[PDB]
Design a protein around this ligand. Structure first.
Ligand SMILES: Nc1nc2c(ncn2[C@@H]2O[C@H](COP(=O)(O)OP(=O)(O)OP(O)(O)=S)[C@@H](O)[C@H]2O)c(=O)[nH]1
Ligand SMILES: [Mg+2]
Length: 248
């Protein structure tokens, strides 16, 4: 006795940052081979209401000498979903609901270098933010100490700001004071410090990934699935998708 709400999360980042590991971690909260192709993974989860969660795994980039050929297949997948949705909106014969395969949210994995963002990730996120909602994440946050994590977060924040990378929740979309407070609590977490679960409590040789004090994956999951879910979709539709509609 519930209804199905669709939600699409895409993981993006360099090779071996724990993208696939986080996906199975995220689904198992309700050797992984090398990701060579873009794969969508869908499972129905009942958080009172049923949600049709789809997670899109992507092959890592930054591994070659030229990475423009790596930033292209992901941009095509995003726009193709924007294309598949638009071909059904113009479809005047269609009596049925449109299935939403559009990427609503996109996690971006940042390597724990402990320094400023590299030109690659900067240019990549600037492209992605222009066509989709990005949520930057500190890949393998267990790599860093407590002190280093604080310093790294402070630095990543400065880059997004200095490079004009608008991440969710974009400040230009805050309605009132109550909307801003909840959004501030989200932005203060960016970049989210996540940890993939090695075997099984979902732990990491030990580090409980579902613990809010050990890492921030528990917060990120609930915020994206429960708290910020509908707001992301609304911005994906009214802002990002309309930007695509006008271009074509
Ligand atoms: N220390 C640590 N290691 C992790 C974490 N998450 C994943 N790993 C390790 O990283 C390695 C790669 O995990 P993986 O899922 O392959 O990243 P990946 O991006 O899929 O590799 P690729 O798909 O981009 S080519 C695995 O050996 C996994 O155990 C994490 O949070 N902390
Ligand atoms: Mg992978």
């Amino acid at each position: 006795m519930k209804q199905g709400f669709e939600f699409n999360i895409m993981v993006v980042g360099q090779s071996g940052l724990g993208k696939s590991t986080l996906i199975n971690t995220l689904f198992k909260s309700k050797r992984i081979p090398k990701t060579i192709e873009i794969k969508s993974i869908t499972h129905d989860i009942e958080e009172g209401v049923r949600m049709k969660l789809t997670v899109i795994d992507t092959p890592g980039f930054g591994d070659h000498i030229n990475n423009e050929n790596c930033w292209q297949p992901i941009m095509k997948f995003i726009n193709d979903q924007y294309e598949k949705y638009l071909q059904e909106e113009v479809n005047i014969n269609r009596k049925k609901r449109i299935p939403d395969t559009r990427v609503h949210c996109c996690l971006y994995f940042i390597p724990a270098t402990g320094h400023s963002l590299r030109p690659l990730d900067i240019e990549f996120m600037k492209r992605l933010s222009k066509v989709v909602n990005i949520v930057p994440v500190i890949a393998k946050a267990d790599t860093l100490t407590l002190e280093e994590r604080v310093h790294f977060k402070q630095r990543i924040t400065a880059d997004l700001l200095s490079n004009g990378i608008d991440v969710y929740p974009q400040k230009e979309f805050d309605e009132d004071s109550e909307d801003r407070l909840v959004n501030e609590k989200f932005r203060e977490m960016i970049p989210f410090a996540v940890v993939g679960s090695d075997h099984e409590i979902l732990g990491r040789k030990t580090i409980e990934v579902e613990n809010t004090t050990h890492c921030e994956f528990a917060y990120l999951r609930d915020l994206l699935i429960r708290t910020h879910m509908q707001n992301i979709k609304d911005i994906t539709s009214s802002i990002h998708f309309e930007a695509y509609r006008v271009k074509r």
